[model samples]
Target: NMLLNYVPVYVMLPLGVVNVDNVFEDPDGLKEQLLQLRAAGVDGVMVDVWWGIIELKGPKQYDWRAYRSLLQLVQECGLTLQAIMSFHQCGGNVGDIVNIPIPQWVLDIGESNHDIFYTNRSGTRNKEYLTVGVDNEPIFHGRTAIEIYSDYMKSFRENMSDFLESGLIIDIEVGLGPAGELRYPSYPQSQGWEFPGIGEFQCYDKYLKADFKAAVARAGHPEWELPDDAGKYNDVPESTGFFKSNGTYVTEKGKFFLTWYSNKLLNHGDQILDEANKAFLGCKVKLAIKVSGIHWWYKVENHAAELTAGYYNLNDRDGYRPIARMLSRHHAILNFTCLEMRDSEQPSDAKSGPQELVQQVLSGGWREDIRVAGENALPRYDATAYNQIILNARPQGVNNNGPPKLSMFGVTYLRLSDDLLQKSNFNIFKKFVLKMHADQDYCANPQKYNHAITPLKPSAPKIPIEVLLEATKPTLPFPWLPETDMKVDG
Candidate 1:
């Protein structure tokens, strides 16, 4: 039996919204805020159950005062909860900037190796907004990366076990990367620097290189060595620069590296989550991973792009399928980031707006019965974009007991407005969520819903299409360029 029939529309209560330091200061604050959330048509909330803050004092030492208060209040509000086990910082949000630190103990442990760091070809380390994770190279407390995260899951089960067991909170968001997505740092401006510009491929780190070498040999290419000559447009050792052309990787060789890399990431993510899932072995409190949602690599023209986006290939059995399969197996949902990236950021011939990438990502686990989800990576210009995300988040059509159903488990962190009170955008958000969730029992018998999910046009006149077009029209002065190559821009 399908236990779930309705999609949850949740608003994010991140540090920007929760402010762990001050969230509980006002006694009546949480009540009023949650009331607003519910009144805004939100049935649930997503908050970062920060790893850094919980263990700020010392190793295995935790201060549960803030969480105790926060969860209690959320319970009082009668809203479902999703927790982000945020091991990283928030200073480098996709569009916003702020420097949040990881726990000191974690910093010391990850940094102790000093060698497992994600070094660029030039051998410089990337700064993680003062954060780190097991995803990138590094051992911890003399334990392997897997052990560190696994142990933490044990502690979390102990600490939050009550809520988890009772199902008061139904989901946990795993921090699978430096900033909560799964990919090695590739962009120069974001994390790379000190040199003229360069996209980072990061296998230069000794531990990672060693691991890569092992995978290569196991694949029967023991004679192979990862190339240092990235600047040569090496695509056989090739160059379509993708898994199947239009995939994010740059060359067949890079795709080979990426498939192996992608496999490792899937393994690490699966292992970490499987360990976490054991915390709620028989219970319903599931784990979730909010990941990058772009068609394969996104835009191209650089070697670094190959490693990161090249890992985007879902068609190749040797590519992204493994990760989707894991998430599917573990019953975890994947939340694609930045709901509406440019069309140029999609795989070849992708549709406009979030639909293209959303459809592509859903296609990964179509036959696997995985739970899929999405969140706003950046602010939506208007209700049109918001509706597009809602519209695109489904498979072409779904039938009961059939494979390849693109289902949206949820659309979250809908902190829809900069101004919480009387914001029109927030209202637009409320209606779409309400409309979508309103007909929870929509055409359930399928033999039914086999008809494609019909996109709902928003109730009109808040922000017209013309206004949206003008706003996103690729205006000059702040030019928006198509996918292309770039010179070093240190």
Candidate 2:
């Protein structure tokens, strides 16, 4: 017999505190917080296994004391776990509040050979993650970047075998690039990039330049070089030489360069995830990869910001499908961000399209037949944000089709912080989790809910589109800029 199943959308929260001292931070309070998480119907917590802290002592040295204790506490609290193999540096990227640099030893290597890090046209090197240009170069104490990553995964599997075998860790998010997301450090704040700016392409390092030049030669255009006309980090699409309405991105050479640029990123993901799939071959955990939501400049033909970040997505083309197809090869999950945002909340001039971006990415993943997950680009606790998350978690259209189909597998809150645990926010979070667990069943038949608690009233009014647009209209001296204080997590 065959039947349709409606799996409840799980709720996950990231650990707010990351201790760089190689120990668990405030075990007593953490236990209390975890208990609160479990009490609220949370499925598990995500922990970043920073290579910085773990391998701080030396080249091959690793200390898992901190994560070991934390995992034990999570198990004790009756909560599950999600482990992030965060190969990137923690600070200087978008939304990073902490400053945990990659192991000092690696930075020392970059000191002698700066090309080990991604370089912009202006020669600004981003240290957030190692450049994909050196993926095969044996620079890390005679180990190539991919080999190093593979060994790290192997070490994690060996160290955490018990947890993996027991199935407490349900997912393993493999970090692909800067900010633990599979994209270039195109909009790094450290490089002075601001929101809505058309970020510069990051292929100027000698290693990547050589590779690009070689590819061009192989493609019968030996003289073709990387775009020198793209504007700086703060320029808009209309003013940019390469990203204008009728610009280079639409030219024959532009398409060739973009195809190569996007493929480099795709290849990097494939290599790393292939190794990750091998490392966890027999594990029960689901593998996942995060894709940044390049929402700004999306309405433009070039999709400037996304192109800079290595997504060839355009106004008339789909760029995320290839990424999703790559993930499908590994049976991976596509964890996307910016689910809490609305298009009306962005500047009109910039043509930011968070809602449309969500739909496109979700549809891409679904079309590829791989599971998709979601996260908020920034920390937002209001009912409006929660409502948007619910809307994106399971689009009403799918619910209308009945129980055979599924929405996103889950939604991960950006973090667990003091603000999140505050009494009022805690209550709101609890209700949100209940709604997530209740899934479409509760929305369709509220009377069937057997629990004593009540989910948010289904009658709650959605924030009106006009009011959102009015609230988001730029008030700053620069009419296209969004709030400067918001922290973004890719």
Candidate 3:
């Protein structure tokens, strides 16, 4: 049975406070704020559950006091909770700086190896890097990480098991790493950076080398160089540049690496969730799981653009396809929270707006079942245009299913005054602004609108008719000069 028909109206609740440290001391205040938000028509709260904070003292101890009361109050107010478990808070520092979660033990395990440190552009060590380090050394801790996560899940289940079978909604958001960090080389056991020994990194550290060699031999690449007696080779680099140049692996290896890393990550995520689900089911609570949206960096002309530009290539396609499949396998909902929305500091240009963004997302063929969330209080373009874009961007046989939906939060609502509204240009831009009243009104009865509009198929014009119109446009301050007009004095 298609579950899309039962999609819930999802809303985000910002923590409001800048830092998470205050959560413990002001549980009452936080609960009060959550109650106020619940009363304000927010159905769900997107709590930034930084992994650094939760796993700071390792699997044994967690700072439950910081958020326990607030979470209970969210349940008390009939609001669903979506936790943004940021694996790496910032570039530097390990364990709950701000509110991000990372176990100190995990960091120490990675730090024990000399080759595992984060490398900088100049080949120097980046002191602040807190991820797996060089050659994806953190894969070594994958099992442990999963265990720690499972423990937390058990704890959460122990405390909130009663609510799971009922009205509460709980979701998990697993962040890969900080912005601009490379995913491949660090987690060589995964797809892109299929470094040797990564597969066995979690399972049988020494046995993985033997297994990889056996596979190599079975493939008849007998001459394939295996590591020396010590099973040691040059360590893998942490950045993309190094991998692109010196990395001597094929696409298959990369795929294997990515699959391995993602599976390990998902295994941990699912195991913890499975335990929670079991606990909730035991209590007669029906639990739904939502994987944290993937964050990809987008820049005009840089690594971010190059990495994520292609929509259908093998590597790019395989990279996230497995993630979707995995999420689906676990009966979880997938949401795409475009972290790059923050990078678009100003309003979108006239050529591109919310409509174009939605179209681009749909065209990517990642997951129509996915929901898109804009981060950093970015402007919400015209909902009508966005809906139109969705219809226009769908494949021939593909039914768009429904119009585009957006969740807005984390900024002051821009209310246009009568004088400002009178301006035509301002009016043109005003449609893009998210209106609280309109949002609330739409949420009340979203189905009444044309959720399933006919796809806007493109057609070629039979004849071109140009409408002649006189218009004066602005010019540059300096007069234009042709290259031929310039003369070299020499």
Candidate 4:
């Protein structure tokens, strides 16, 4: 068990995995779920306290009465809880798995603020998601959304005062953007931007546009307007270089535009993280935020085309610097998901999947200096997936597994209780967890042969195997450069 082992960073094993998705209306179910996980040798449970529910009470008002059962039960079960303050709504997923929704107050707040939600190139406002960096409470609410988020967090800390102080309520995962992950609200999933629905969307609302434009101006490109065609790619193939190694953008204009856009996504993320981290720091529980964990370099065609419709570039090894640096500096955990890509029935090498770069610590962007953790995105129960996980979990990067352990991890989500836990066949899966955890914590610390890998030494990437950076020219001093540089041909 990751909880029972000594690793560089904390290892979180999720149980009742997505019970968070239904917890607001199903407290008793969650309690029973936690109860079973604890019996399974799990001392930690992951859950989410939705912002939409708390916001249901109106701005600056929160009543977690429904959550008391879980708080009390988790403590009674003697399990540390990693609660996610779900800033985004959880409804309308792939299967329409509905749960807490985006608070209506925020929806009204968005319109009153001339719509604080993200807009596409066509100025289509996305109400399903909103950013904390944007101000929703000005002349209307008397507090910024960030301030209100902090307020509800304070309310939770106060309500769970005993647990918060006792460390029973351990870490809190806050959403910096949609789906509790950090990035621009680049995806139009609310409109069903699922598989085979590829398109890019721009951030053209009041706040993000202002910041984006300011960034552009700062980059010497006030004239460099937001692309009307950003995220417009559809029916596109992965073979063409969507990544830098393959030559991203392939045009001076595209690369320069990319430089500024990626630059600001990092800045905005830091703003969102710093604010959330501030509220969570005093609670003593570490804060965690996730990035799209798909290996952006692998299957360059398909990965990008999925969730964000390929407009995003923040999922890479080098691009991950902001998240890694923040977590490292704060001594918190930086967790990423999507490791279960190995679950494919087709023949696959453990190191050939999306997690290979992380397993190998491939780029300077996959900063080794930071605290790291990961979770499996798929909720599969087959032998192939499980065996793939075992092989993938091995410390494959340059390292000898011995002493004090190099890095430890065994981790995630789409609802476990109903899937693997509830099924009559789940007994085998339960047994699997016990065996993998070895149903024991024999050693006190990481043994001589634990997984270990190297972190990036510099930003530009030296590891060409996966996160290769074929440096065409030195990075420009300004993202504001004229298109003449044909810049760093995509």
Candidate 5:
């Protein structure tokens, strides 16, 4: 019962459906679902605002009908809506999803540099590349898409100014290009002829060469003729090898080269997130702005690289901290989801059992500050009482698709326990604590294991205190900022 008292119920709506197309086709159906969920006492509903769909045709051709309706229904039902603004959903199998589906007008603003686009494996422009102006080009700080989306969001909020009371959650998933390539369209930013990024990349390209030359000069080594192309700089043969002669030097140098390229991409990613939040907060919506669980491995492969890139190389600690600080400025909460390793459920042969895996994620220093929401293929494991309640209440069919599979006897037990937790104001926390206690109890007294304590450390930090407080916080005044005065300099 102490376990039940400590953990709380956090009803999560995986938010599988409800994209732009889904909203447009079945606004009424979506509304019905929202009402049903509310009647069922669901805590919140997560809805994704796929940027590709909202800004599909261009700025003016927005199909906001469904979005408006869905938000309206959420308000009517008095349910919280978590809005995931997915910038990139892998369209075409080239690489990570590029953010190119914005209004055509936004694209036209930078048409002068047609050659500047990233040339994908298909030898054509990677439509996934989301860039607009010279400044925000993938080569530079890469703030173009964020700037556009931010403005669009501001406009959306301005139009729907009345629905500000409904809460808002903004989710951003980071991506990787083919083989850690940073330049748009998967090529070095400085190499191509007539490319917009070429000039900028070239400038940096030259600076690096100059710096290398200075280092060589300082060593008093006679300077050899430098090649005109930076791409060819690494083409030295074994005999002509200078740094390549030593195996360690070659390996270390190669790593340095890749790290430099990776940093550029990471910096660009950070810039995009920062400006996107700025644009969102600028919209003057009374709704709260928060970062939904961020999936870092959406692109990277090799667990080590994923961890190193997301945590260390990206300097996520530093980069994400600033973004968190910025969101806090707007009174937003940041929530992180564990890296969903593979698309499938937790494998049977997993080194750590499901419970251990969950515990590890809880202990991982990805974002110790925020609430870590655990999700995988199967929602098994009742380490916490909250989990047990959800698992027990989950409609069991052949899979998750049959009549709620609990016998009258089981239902009675669940209801009685649920009532106890709800009445004692320990619904959510009780669930979690109960799971921990139950797991430990089971491990200790296997023969008498009545689903009792099986031993689990609190994997995630306590539900983000700020998030709960903000949820109850009164809606603030909308700051009616004018449209951004950003003009594209062709």
Candidate 6:
């Protein structure tokens, strides 16, 4: 009975069935897999409601029939769903096995302008996502990027009203950037970046360059230009002037540039989330945004890879706190990845620190009193990975020099695949799910574990914002920058 009070970390599975054809691949198999996941005690499944598929025909032309059918199947399986408003293209990003480009009409705009996409110093374009510099520009059929994203979410909210009303869709994780994670496409695999490389900054496009120029002018360094020696996408931190030890990153100019770059990224998420909050205002569903696990090069003083990816985090500064604070304003959850990775598993020379990064990012959310979720960076069903996830879901040894701690809100497996559905893997996964439930006594009847927690019912009383705000008093003090205008009336 004591276990009844403990809230089991929600374990969800990703419905990785998107294809270039804009339809669910292998519907019958997907149904079978959903049943297996449901039987294995999975709380829900995360679906990629891809913009490429929904708006494939043209601007304002959406085809949600595919997703509607998929959601219906999920509901039929007696499981909940988390729909991702994935605005970015699926292919070429990390863990992308399929190619799903953004709407061709939008990419058509990039053909001539080129600045519609993020550009590297070599003028190479990354088509995975639109440049944040163009967020306010009326490019897509006279619609700004934010407007387009807002409209897309609005359409989903309206079209999927049945799922919303039934409480089958419990969350809407907004895609703020590439790979559905709220970070720049700094380490794009298509851009010649490899593990441990200090990815080059993606502000070479004319629009972002203009913004950076203005930023420098305002900083009273009108002559200051973006880093000319930040090195290429394949260089290590030690090889770069900006990221090397005692390099420009620790200097005032470097601070100004890094701050401006990362702020642009933060503002991008802020604006999108503001609209997302508006789109899903009255729905009982929760909102979430994924923060990529830029773990490699993390131990370096400058945190080169993260910086390039628009995270200003350094050995001295906590860059993720501001992000968590922004999410707090919107009552949104912070979804992070790389929960399955251990520091020992990474290349030691890379100075990778996935474990520490998870701790810091998770702690950042907890410090802000936001719900934090996690996912594995890669697909691995080994018990070691599951145990690591369990350890992270409810971290240990976090001392506030006071009282109380935090735990992850949920853990979403990378995806549903044939290998994962095999009898051997499925058996291990069943035990993993039971472990996720945190009570072995009910392993035989895990559906009871669902009943132990507060149900997400339409009739359930919505928690007051004031009470939720008062529930958390943040621990650990750090010099945080003043919060930008990321206000959302939750």
Error of 6 at 41 (Å): 1.0
Tell me the tens digit of each residue's lDDT in model 3 across 1-490. Answer: 1111212323444432324443555556556655544444444556555555666665566666555665667777776765544445432333323433245666676566433333322233322323232222225445533344446655655665555444354454444334312232222211222212111122123323344456657766645432221111122222333123333222444434323333344343344445444433433222233222222221111112212211111222333333333433334334433322321332332111322232243233234243333332233333333222222222121213633233211112112223223445334323322122222222323234322212212221211111100001111111111111111111
Count backbone clashes in candidate 6.
0
The per-model lDDT (C-alpha) reads 0.54, 0.75, 0.35, 0.51, 0.34, 0.76
RMSD of 4: 10.0
Candidate 1: global Cα-lDDT? 0.54
The estimated TM-scores of all candidates read 0.73, 0.86, 0.50, 0.74, 0.47, 0.87
> TM-score: which is higher, 2 or 3?
2
> If the candidates were sorted by their lDDT against the true structure, best first, what order would they fall in?
6, 2, 1, 4, 3, 5
Expressed as tens digits, the lDDT of each residue in 1-490 for candidate 2 is: 0112222333344443547778676889888878887776676778789989898887879998778888888889877777889999876455766678888899999999999999999898888899899999998899999988898998999999988776678789999999899998888788787898888899999998999899999989999989988889999977877888778888888888987888788889878887887787777677899999999988766789999999888755567877776777677789999988988888788889887788888877776687889899888778777767766765642332334244677678878888988998878776666556533222222123221112111211233323322322211111111321111111
4 or 5: which has the higher lDDT?
4
Model 5, stretches more than 4 Å misplaced?
Answer: 1-23, 60-63, 90-126, 129-135, 138-143, 166-250, 280-335, 338-490
**Per-candidate count of clashing residue pairs (backbone under 3 Å):** 17, 0, 20, 15, 39, 0
Ranking by TM-score: 6, 2, 4, 1, 3, 5
lDDT of 3 at 395: 19
CA RMSD per model (angstroms): 12.2, 10.3, 15.6, 10.0, 17.0, 7.6
Displacement of the residue 36 alpha carbon in candidate 5, Å: 3.8
lDDT of 4 by residue, 147-174 (tens): 6667777687778777777666656777
- Whole-structure CA lDDT of model 5: 0.34
Candidate 6 at residue 413, lDDT? 87
Worst lDDT 10-window in candidate 3: 464-473
Tens digit of per-residue lDDT, candidate 1, span 342-448: 45544462222343444445555454456677787665646555545555443332223543234566678556344543566556666655544533333322223
Off by over 4 Å in 3: 1-23, 27-40, 75-78, 84-101, 110-143, 162-166, 174-318, 339-490
Candidate achieving the largest TM-score: 6
